[PDB]
């Protein structure tokens, strides 16, 4: 087996087509299903897998109570084939309250973070064995992508942050060969806060669209040079911004370089990708809540500051339904590299207080060069039907 | 591994022998089992799989309530090895309220349709990745076979319809190579309405026996030329007709060319296949309801208009028990291609109102050149024992 | 992969050592587990599988009620790796209320019988597809081994009976190549009634120890010549007889040739095998009930009429616990062919009337040339703890 | 595939990083999960497996009552991929109330002991078949490691004891080739009592750190010469001793040669390993009870009698939480052999009497040459949330 190089052009797409849905919460009302959050998707050269952070319990289980909390020692990374819900036969790949995973063409890498807030440990597991680890560098919740890392020619990269969630922090970009950390580069450029990067191969390098939790409702960009380990960063140009919270479309701004200081504090994991001067992006439909999900293309959204002409919009989840995190993954076709995305569909607390748990299902779409229609694919569980 | 060509003679059979049964509904009363409908069977060159459309829920689950409806966003295509019931470890292959799947000798193709009635999307997934998609062309429930598609030398064909369920509609035949649509041919010939085709390889081409939902209780035939993409169509000659509803045997007719205008509106998915001048076919035992299931050979049933001499009848499901859709699949043997069929056994609403759900199990038979006896293999669940 | 020839000497053993146990009934009180009976074990060249006839339901399920009955349309053959209990992910291999399975070195053969008592059908499934079938020849419960068939050089043999359970019947020996019946030989020799054969390879032929349900408490022997399809039959010489019911050891007899007319009517499936002049055999400890299970070697038990000197006895299940059917399977080692056996542990009705179901677990032992101790490995469920 | 030789240097480590956690007990409160104890981990050359001794029942099941007992006929060895909890699809590999397993590079060996206390049987299963067996030699609970055995160049070694738990016993070291016992060496050297060895490859031989249940709270060492079958034994030098119970650190002693006669009676399975003159070891945090778990390096802990200078301590489980057995396993990396360990986390009786069962979950760490932080990873179940 050969290392992936992702050395094909990006598929020219017209939008996205339905790919997968797991119905986790509906199933949880009649079956033993893991409580999760922070899901993502990543594929080996043959097939795709769904991942999530378990909460060390199933939903219909008293331990599901107060699973709104992000960090407990019992969180583990779950991995199934895409479309297989997280049932009791699911493998817990590592201990993790924050993670990233990727396949380099030969084997899986998993980056798993657990332990004390002020002194966490990141474990690096490759091809079924622990190869490396690193401890917290800023003593304030060492944390990573919650989506797939990216490997080119046997070197995988992942973005990690340690430090304040509401002020300047310490972001580093790791380069890993067969599970071994071979280089660490500090964040460089104009991005001022980086969380939860959604990265993708853009041969010869890697590009990430992330979350600014401090001053920006525009999404930061991190560019990773795999030849020399140099880092650059900026913000997505589009005046239609991707974070939540954010200003309405008529009063939102981005200058490509600085955080916009528009409802900048807090955020949600998300994604976007460039195509020439244009930008494909997703976001919640609501400007303030993790509600709904839409995708569209922004004409000049990559190259032109404050561009706001969109086209090819698709509703993925209507605004009467809950969404959550979302992220990108890439899939190699015969001639081109395709871009796909998943959307986390969060149910329970804090928004729905009839139940005491917090969990999610997922829906997944992939880029298409063909045509498509309309729809809405929300979680679909009736909150009144659920065990509390 | 090589592409399938199905370039062997059809097996000469004497009837059918028991092959598989999943007991889905009996098991649902003591286990977490998916609610499904529209099942089918398809085999890779080594082994067979059962498929069905899930309803995004298990049976013993409040979400099973009112699952009689055909189209919701939570329907996904399920795929297990044949005989493995749809338990919680079942893979949801794609999002779909209508589907078709087939293996070309190298990899699986799945055709999955979901979304709004008036603006649906068909996704084409091959070897684990989304390769193509197409949107609705008549804005009225784009829909497909609910049984296996057929591939010859790397080109797979599938029949799809969009438009009225009770009048002229727009039927097209797609040719797909490794998930990529390479040609689309409009329906041609004398068939006037086409739904839910049951297709099979008949080298060098593909033949389908379908459902006319408009004016015929005789079943339409669609013939597909894989070399030049030409289409022809007609009706099964047999005066013993295959649809439900239909006239009594003494007053049913077919002229091989036109819908018979005998209780023609509505219908049920079904199958038949030719052997020289004769016809093997299945149908419900009841003339008006989806009750019972029988197979037989009609002497001159392929070539002689209105032929009514049957022989080699077998009861598959007695008329005191519910059936449902049925369809064909083909299995390559050492010297010949065999024909098999499945029967959907529908339980719950609208026929059985003690429970609020609608689901099914399956029974499966394959052609035999040997001998056999008699029996009846219905769903077998006691409606009074079920969770409602 | 090559066809099995079993052309090695039989392992010289000193007794048997513990190999597997599934605890099916204990687990059934806290989990969804199939209701079964008539289990057996058979191994491919790499690993062993457990088989049983399902009753189309799990135990904690209202459909488990009155599963004492031997024949319903919902019985299917289950197949898991040995030691994996029959959970809801278990594959139902075929429809069957009587079966036999075996691997020829290349693929699995399954012989599955279902349908009406007076007109049953036996299906032959090889390498995942239906290859042949045969109908009832005597119109009175066509039936077969309920343990493994045996293949030499690509030809598998299986023994089937059709006709009276309490008088002369019609027993035939089938020879099957890649699922295709190539020859059928009538029973010949002095055995007067044959049921439920436990067969094993004894290169160049196959030897079976069976059950006489009419006049013998001594077990019939069927010898199968694989070169010319000729059949011979007799009775096990040992004066310590293997069937249940039977006379006590002080008043039991066998002359090697005729049924002994000692408590001959009825019986239980069982096994024995020859080693030179000696015989290894198992049987229930009780002479009248399917209670307990013991094995031992009978000195001169193969060659000497009415021999009653035993040695190397082992208790497998003590006589305070229920047993049931038992049968042989053979496993190829580096230098020799080993003999193993399973014991069915039947719980529920008719012996235990607190519950309404009938089911079983299994325990499995293999021949050893080493040493061993003592024990008892019964089903182990507390009948008072079970769902009724 | 080739036999393992473990002919690489030991990885130089700085401590341990989180590797796996199964959350078995939390899950048992909302799912059907096996009752177990005495777990361990062992890896084939590609991936790791978790093993444990089942109690023939799930937790939420009346049969879980009084599962504190160590030996019943229904105990079987369970084997899943590491991180897959023991759900109902788990394979029971053999019948066993004491076990050891290991992979020689080609296939799995399992050593399974069951039967009467005074006359037990050890079965040896290799590559899926029973190859050998041995009976009890001292008629007093024949028993073995409860962790992985070790194979070099096709010979596997395992340590077994038979005899008193509180006085001199009969310990033997077996050498097994492809499941066949080829040599048995008696214990030799100065270790006076040996139980539950935790062994590891130390090319060209094998080294074990065990439990002295008679006179020592210092842990015995057994060294195994694989070339000539000679045995030597002693005690771990470290004055910080590894057993439980044990004296306080200020009053504990070891002289490397003899049991220390300090709270020596009883004990707990545990581990340690040498690196030059230093020692890496784990132990319960509590001196008298199986509570908490810590690891550290003892400077001079291998070579210097009574050394008590520790460094690089890590809390694995805080002392407010239950631990249990622990043991070592080795994983081959690219350049070196790494050492990992598991910790059994025992819940229920006798410590927690609200429930009537006794079971466990596990947590697993592996050696790292990188860095790490702090945490605590206990079982995590709320005893008040459990079925009793
Ligand atoms: C069946 O399904 C298809 C595929 O989903 C639908 O077609 C899509 O429809 C949407 C909505 O109309 C299109 O997305 C929109 O594109 C607009 C730009 O294109 C128009 O205007 C410019 C010039 O001004 C031209 O380039 C172009 O030719 C069009 O005339 C955007 O302006 C839209 O954004 C604005 O409206 C949306 C709400 O719709 C707001 O949320 C935004 O904030 C913004 O104000 C939007 O992006 C999409 O391009 C179409 N796709 C394709 C491939 O054609 C069909 O509509 C659907 N049919 C029905 C009846 O359901
Ligand atoms: C044990 O199992 C076997 C196999 O299933 C059964 O044999 C089958 O029996 C059925 C019913 O008799 C047969 O199917 C029937 O064939 C008839 C035609 O064949 C006869 O008549 C013509 C004369 O021209 C000859 O060609 C031929 O040789 C036969 O003499 C059809 O007329 C039947 O259809 C009519 O009756 C059925 C109800 O039975 C109605 O539903 C139809 O509408 C119609 O009126 C029917 O198709 C079948 O051919 C037999 N199979 C084989 C291979 O022999 C045994 O009967 C069964 N025994 C028992 C007691 O269970
Ligand atoms: C630890 O475990 C081992 C292995 O299981 C036990 O050893 C076995 O013990 C049984 C019972 O004694 C042995 O089986 C018996 O063999 C007898 C024949 O051998 C004896 O007598 C003849 C000469 O007469 C000699 O060949 C031989 O040397 C012996 O002296 C049979 O007579 C027995 O059958 C009779 O008794 C049984 C009940 O035990 C009745 O049920 C029968 O109907 C019959 O009347 C029996 O077959 C067996 O051979 C031993 N195995 C081995 C390998 O030695 C140990 O006993 C056990 N230790 C303890 C204390 O538990
Ligand atoms: C973030 O996480 C890291 C990694 O876990 C923690 O660093 C570890 O901290 C522990 C506790 O301090 C260290 O283990 C201890 O090492 C001591 C010896 O090392 C010091 O002293 C000698 C002087 O001769 C020097 O060799 C050496 O350089 C150090 O100066 C031992 O004495 C300790 O044992 C004693 O204390 C423990 C309780 O802590 C008792 O239980 C023992 O019985 C004994 O009395 C102990 O072994 C460990 O070495 C550190 N690891 C590394 C790699 O640096 C951070 O502390 C943590 N930070 C926070 C705030 O969480
Ligand atoms: C989830 O846990 C919370 C916190 O313990 C539970 O809320 C408490 O429930 C008790 C009843 O035992 C009340 O007396 C307290 O007043 C509650 N505290 C709070 C914060 O409201 C809650 O009941 C649990 N949920 C379930 C379904 O068990
Ligand atoms: C399935 O859903 C239907 C619709 O909600 C339920 O039927 C209703 O039950 C409510 C009481 O809860 C009544 O007020 C209505 O009269 C019913 N509506 C109809 C259409 O009959 C039904 O109870 C549900 N089934 C189950 C098992 O909960
Ligand atoms: C199993 O089925 C039997 C037969 O129906 C049940 O026995 C009957 O139960 C009813 C109660 O509904 C009694 O009125 C009848 O007298 C019973 N008949 C017999 C033969 O005793 C039995 O209850 C069922 N078992 C369970 C647990 O549901
Ligand atoms: C576990 O088993 C024990 C022993 O049978 C049960 O404890 C007994 O309960 C009975 C009543 O059913 C009392 O008569 C005895 O006093 C109890 N015996 C002891 C030793 O305390 C216990 O109830 C069982 N646990 C569960 C959950 O059923
Ligand atoms: Ca923000
Ligand atoms: Ca019709
Ligand atoms: Ca008899
Ligand atoms: Ca001790």
Tokens of D207: 């080294």
Q: Which of C31, C35, C57 to mutate to test the interface with B (most CBs of B within 10 A)?
A: C57
Which one is catalytic: C70, C223, C232, C318?
C70
Q: Which chains touch D (3 or more CB pairs under 8 A)?
A: A, C
CA dihedral D38, D44, D46, D48 (to 10 degrees): 0
Distance CA C105, CA C154 (A): 8
Query: Among residues D202, B22, A198, which one has the least CA distance to residue C73?
Result: B22
Q: Which helix (H) or strand (E) holds A359?
A: strand A358-368
Phi-psi region of D250 (alpha: psi -120 to 50; beta: other; left: phi over 0): alpha
Instruction: Please tell me the distance between residue B216's alpha carbon and the centre of ligand 10 in angstroms.
Output: 5
Cβ neighbours around D283 below 10 Å, total: 24
Chain C residues in contact with D116 by the CB 8 A cut-off are: 373-375
Instruction: Please tell me the distance between residue B320's alpha carbon and the centre of ligand 10 in angstroms.
Output: 23
Beta-carbon contacts of B18 under 8 Å, excluding residues fewer than 6 positions away, are: B363, B364, B365, B375, B377, C94, C95, C112, C114, C115, C121, C123
Distance CA A281, CA A278 (A): 10
Tokens of D321: 């939480």
Count CA atoms within 13 Å of residue A368 on its CB side.
Answer: 28
The CATH number for B1-388, chosen from 3.30.300.30, 3.90.76.10, 3.50.50.60, 2.120.10.10, is: 2.120.10.10
Query: Among residues D223, D140, D139, D130, which one has the least CA distance to residue D181?
Result: D130
CB C331 within 8 A of CB C44: no
Q: What angle do CA C258, C259, C265 make, to 5 degrees?
A: 165
CB B249 within 8 A of CB B218: no
Tokens of A277: 């001067």
Instruction: Please tell me the distance between residue B310's alpha carbon and the centre of ligand 2 in angstroms.
Output: 8
CB A116 within 8 A of CB D375: yes
Beta-carbon contacts of B123 under 8 Å, excluding residues fewer than 6 positions away, are: A17, A18, A19, A368, B94, B95, B110, B111, B112, B113, B114, B130, B132, B133
Tokens of C60: 């904690």
Bridge-based pairing of strands B291-298 and D119-126 is: unpaired
Concatenated DSSP letters for D82-119? TT---BTT-EEEEE-SEEEEEE-SSSEEEEEEEEETTE
Query: Among residues D136, D4, D3, D156, which one has the least CA distance to residue D71?
Result: D136
Q: Which helix (H) or strand (E) holds A177?
A: strand A169-177
CB B287 within 8 A of CB B244: yes
Measure in Å the smallest separation between the Cα of A17 and chain B Cα atoms: 6
- CB–CB of A30 and B60 under 8 A? yes
Distance CA C160, CA C147 (A): 12
Tokens of C302: 């193969």
Nearest-Å Rg of the Cα atoms of chain B is: 19
Residue A257: DSSP 8-state: S
Q: What are phi and psi of B263, to 5 degrees?
A: 40, 45
Measure in Å the smallest separation between the Cα of A303 and chain B Cα atoms: 29
Domain definitions of chain C by residue range? 1-388
Query: How many residues does the structure list for chain A?
Result: 388
- Annotated binding-site residue numbers of B for Ca(2+): 212, 216, 243, 264, 266
Beta bridge partners of D20: D364
Q: Which of B57, B92, B116 sits opposite A21 (nearest CB)?
A: B92
Q: Which helix (H) or strand (E) holds A170?
A: strand A169-177
Distance CA A125, CA A109 (A): 6
Q: What angle do CA C155, C124, B151 make, to 5 degrees?
A: 105
Cβ neighbours around A388 below 10 Å, total: 12
Query: Which whole-number Å values give the CA distances from D373 to A173, A351, D18, D376, in the listed order?
Result: 19, 34, 10, 11
CA dihedral D90, D115, C38, C221 (to 10 degrees): 140
Cis status of the peptide bond prior to A245, with omega within 30 of 0: yes
Q: Give the 3-state secondary structure of residue B125.
A: strand
Instruction: Please tell me the distance between residue B311's alpha carbon and the centre of ligand 2 in angstroms.
Output: 6
Query: Among residues A251, A200, A246, A201, which one has the least CA distance to residue A219?
Result: A246
Query: Which whole-number Å values give the CA distances from B329 to B53, B277, B337, C132, D101, in the listed order?
Result: 17, 21, 10, 17, 45
Distance CA D211, CA D109 (A): 23
Bridge-based pairing of strands D291-298 and B108-116 is: unpaired
Q: Which residue has the tokens 């002689």?
A: B304
Concatenated DSSP letters for A37-60? EEEEEEE-SS-EEEEEEEEEEESS
Probe target for ligand 6 pocket from B35, B59, B64, B65, with the most ligand atoms within 8 Å of CB: B65
Q: Give the 3-state secondary structure of residue A319.
A: strand
Q: Give the 3-state secondary structure of residue D26.
A: helix
Query: Which whole-number Å values give the CA distances from D318 to A330, B361, C258, D290, D292, in the listed order?
Result: 42, 51, 74, 11, 5
Question: Does A37 carry a binding-site annotation?
Answer: yes
- CB–CB of A57 and D23 under 8 A? yes
Chain A residues in contact with B123 by the CB 8 A cut-off are: 17-19, 368
Q: Which residue has the tokens 């992939």?
A: A366
CB B98 within 8 A of CB B113: yes
Distance CA A285, CA A295 (A): 9
Q: Which of A60, A120, A133 sits opposite D30 (nearest CB)?
A: A60
Distance CA D216, CA D238 (A): 13
CA dihedral A75, A81, A85, A91 (to 10 degrees): -40
SS3 of chain C: CCCCCCCCCECCCCEEEEEEECCHHHHHCCCCCEEEEEEEEEECCCCEEEEEEEEEEECCCHHHCCCCCCCCCCCEEEEEECCCCCCCCCEEEEECCEEEEEECCCCEEEEEEEEECCEEEEEEEECCEEEEEEECCCCCCCECCCCCCEEECCEEEEEEEEECCCCCEEEEEEEEECCEEEEEEECCCCCCCCEEEEEEEECCEEEEEEECCCCCCCCEEEEECCCCCCEEEEECCCCCCCCCCCCCCCCCCCCCCCCCCCCCCCCCCCCEEEECCEEEEEECCCCCCCEEEEEEEECCCCCCCCCCCEEEEEEEEEEEEECCCEEEEEEECCCCEEEEEEEEEEEECCCCCCCCCEEEEEEEEEEECCCCCCCCCCCCCCHHHCCC
CB of A65 shorter than 6 A to ligand 5: yes
Q: Give the 3-state secondary structure of residue D63.
A: helix
**Nearest-CA residue of chain C relative to B375?**
C115
Beta-carbon contacts of D202 under 8 Å, excluding residues fewer than 6 positions away, are: D10, D274
Alpha carbon of residue B43 to chain centroid: 14
CB D219 within 8 A of CB D236: yes
Distance CA B331, CA D385 (A): 52
Q: Which of C20, C89, C376 sits opposite D89 (nearest CB)?
A: C89
Q: What are phi and psi of B25, to 5 degrees?
A: -75, -40
Count CA atoms within 13 Å of residue D121 on its CB side.
Answer: 29
Chain B residues in contact with C141 by the CB 8 A cut-off are: none
CB D102 within 8 A of CB D151: yes
Count CA atoms within 13 Å of residue B296 on its CB side.
Answer: 21
CB A24 within 8 A of CB A55: no
CB C130 within 8 A of CB B368: yes
Beta-carbon contacts of D228 under 8 Å, excluding residues fewer than 6 positions away, are: none
Distance CA D83, CA A78 (A): 9
CB C54 within 8 A of CB C78: yes
Chain D residues in contact with A114 by the CB 8 A cut-off are: 18, 375, 377
Ligand nearest to the CA of A62: 5
Phi-psi region of A31 (alpha: psi -120 to 50; beta: other; left: phi over 0): left
CB of B65 shorter than 6 A to ligand 6: yes
Cis status of the peptide bond prior to B245, with omega within 30 of 0: yes
Q: Which helix (H) or strand (E) holds A28?
A: helix A24-28
Cβ neighbours around C172 below 10 Å, total: 19
Tokens of C360: 């079983």
Count CA atoms within 13 Å of residue A247 on its CB side.
Answer: 15
Query: Which whole-number Å values give the CA distances from D1 to A243, D4, D44, in the listed order?
Result: 52, 9, 12
Q: Which residue has the tokens 């080109």?
A: B155
Resolution (A): 1.8
Q: B12: buried, middle or exposed (CB in 10 Å: 19+, 13-18, 0-12)?
A: exposed
Residue A24: DSSP 8-state: H
Alpha carbon of residue C48 to chain centroid: 15
Sheet holding C98-103, edge to edge: C98-103, C108-116, C119-126, C129-135
CB of A388 shorter than 6 A to ligand 5: yes
End-to-end CA distance of chain D: 48
Which one is catalytic: B70, B223, B232, B318?
B70
Q: Which helix (H) or strand (E) holds D25?
A: helix D24-28
Query: Among residues A54, A87, A42, which one has the least CA distance to residue A359?
Result: A54
Query: Among residues B211, A238, B371, C347, which one has the least CA distance to residue A246?
Result: A238
Beta-carbon contacts of A250 under 8 Å, excluding residues fewer than 6 positions away, are: none
Distance CA B375, CA D229 (A): 66
Distance CA B90, CA D125 (A): 32
- CB–CB of B90 and A81 under 8 A? no
Alpha carbon of residue D369 to chain centroid: 23
Residue D9: DSSP 8-state: P
Distance CA D170, CA C230 (A): 56
Measure in Å the smallest separation between the Cα of B380 and chain C Cα atoms: 7
Question: Does A211 carry a binding-site annotation?
Answer: yes
Chain B residues in contact with A17 by the CB 8 A cut-off are: 121, 123, 130, 133
Query: How many residues does the structure list for chain B?
Result: 388
Concatenated DSSP letters for A181-249? EEEEEE--SS----EEEEEEEETTEEEEEEE-SSS-SSPEEEEE-TTT--EEEEE---SS--SSS---T
Size of interface A-D (CB pairs under 8 A): 152
Helix residue ranges per DSSP H, A235-341: none
CB of A356 shorter than 6 A to ligand 5: yes
Bridge-based pairing of strands A220-224 and A205-211 is: antiparallel
Beta-carbon contacts of D250 under 8 Å, excluding residues fewer than 6 positions away, are: none
Distance CA A36, CA A74 (A): 11
| DSSP3 helix / strand / coil % (chain D, rounded to 5) | 5, 50, 50
CA dihedral B6, B12, B16, B18 (to 10 degrees): -60
Nearest CA, atom 31, ligand 1: A311
CB B6 within 8 A of CB B203: yes
Q: Which chains touch C (3 or more CB pairs under 8 A)?
A: B, D
Beta bridge partners of A164: none
Alpha carbon of residue D218 to chain centroid: 16
Query: Which whole-number Å values give the CA distances from A80 to A83, A92, A249, B85, B89, in the listed order?
Result: 8, 9, 38, 19, 10
Query: Which whole-number Å values give the CA distances from A177 to A150, B20, C274, D11, in the listed order?
Result: 12, 49, 61, 18
Probe target for ligand 4 pocket from D313, D316, D373, with the most ligand atoms within 8 Å of CB: D313
| DSSP3 helix / strand / coil % (chain B, rounded to 5) | 5, 50, 50
Residue B31: DSSP 8-state: S
Atom number of ligand 4 nearest to Cα D310: 47
CB B235 within 8 A of CB B216: yes
CB B81 within 8 A of CB B50: yes
Residue D31: DSSP 8-state: S
Biggest alpha carbon–alpha carbon distance for chain B? 55
Tokens of A78: 């779950």
Instruction: Please tell me the distance between residue A347's alpha carbon and the centre of ligand 5 in angstroms.
Output: 19
Q: Which of C59, C88, C94 sits opposite B87 (nearest CB)?
A: C88
Tokens of D149: 């055995």
Query: Among residues A260, B48, D330, A341, which one has the least CA distance to residue C128?
Result: B48
CB D377 within 8 A of CB A114: yes
Technique used = X-ray
Q: C251: buried, middle or exposed (CB in 10 Å: 19+, 13-18, 0-12)?
A: exposed
- CB–CB of D131 and C87 under 8 A? no
Distance CA D44, CA D34 (A): 23
- CB–CB of B373 and C116 under 8 A? yes
């Amino acid at each position: 087996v050969e290392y992936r190089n992702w050395s094909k052009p990006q598929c020219q797409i017209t939008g996205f087509a339905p790919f997968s849905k797991d119905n986790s919460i509906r199933l949880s009302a009649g079956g033993d299903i893991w409580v999760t959050r922070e899901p993502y998707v990543s594929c080996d050269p043959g097939k795709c897998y769904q991942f999530a952070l378990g909460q060390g319990t199933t939903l219909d289980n008293k331990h599901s109570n107060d699973t709104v909390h992000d960090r407990i020692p019992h969180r583990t990374l779950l991995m199934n084939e895409l479309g297989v819900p997280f049932h009791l036969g699911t493998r817990q790949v590592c201990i993790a309250w924050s993670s990233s995973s990727c396949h380099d063409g030969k084997a899986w890498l998993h980056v798993c973070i657990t332990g004390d807030d002020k002194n966490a440990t990141a474990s690096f597991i490759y091809d079924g064995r622990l190869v490396d680890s690193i401890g917290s560098w800023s003593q304030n919740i060492l944390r990573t992508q919650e989506s797939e890392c990216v490997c080119i020619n046997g070197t995988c990269t992942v973005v990690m942050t340690d430090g304040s969630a509401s002020g300047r922090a310490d972001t580093r970009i790791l380069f890993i060969e067969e599970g071994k950390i071979v280089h660490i580069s500090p964040l460089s450029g104009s991005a001022q806060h980086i969380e939860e990067c959604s990265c993708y191969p853009r041969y010869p390098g890697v590009r990430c669209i992330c979350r600014d939790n401090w001053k920006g409702s525009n999404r930061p960009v991190v560019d990773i040079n795999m030849e020399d380990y140099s880092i650059d960063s900026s913000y997505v140009c589009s005046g239609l911004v991707g974070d939540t919270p954010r200003n309405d479309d008529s009063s939102s701004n981005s200058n490509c370089r600085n955080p916009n200081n528009e409802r900048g504090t807090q955020g949600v994991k998300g994604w976007a990708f460039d195509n020439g001067n244009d930008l494909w992006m997703g976001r919640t439909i609501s400007k303030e809540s993790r509600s709904g999900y839409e995708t569209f293309k922004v004409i000049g959204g990559w190259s032109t500051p404050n561009s706001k002409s969109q086209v090819n919009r698709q509703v993925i989840v209507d605004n009467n339904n809950w969404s959550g995190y979302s992220g990108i993954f890439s899939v190699e076709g015969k001639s081109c590299i395709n871009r796909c995305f998943y959307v986390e569909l969060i149910r329970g607390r804090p928004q729905e207080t009839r139940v005491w748990w917090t969990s999610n299902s997922i829906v997944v779409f992939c880029g298409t060069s063909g045509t498509y229609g309309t729809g809405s694919w929300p979680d679909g569980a009736n909150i009144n039907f659920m065990p509390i």
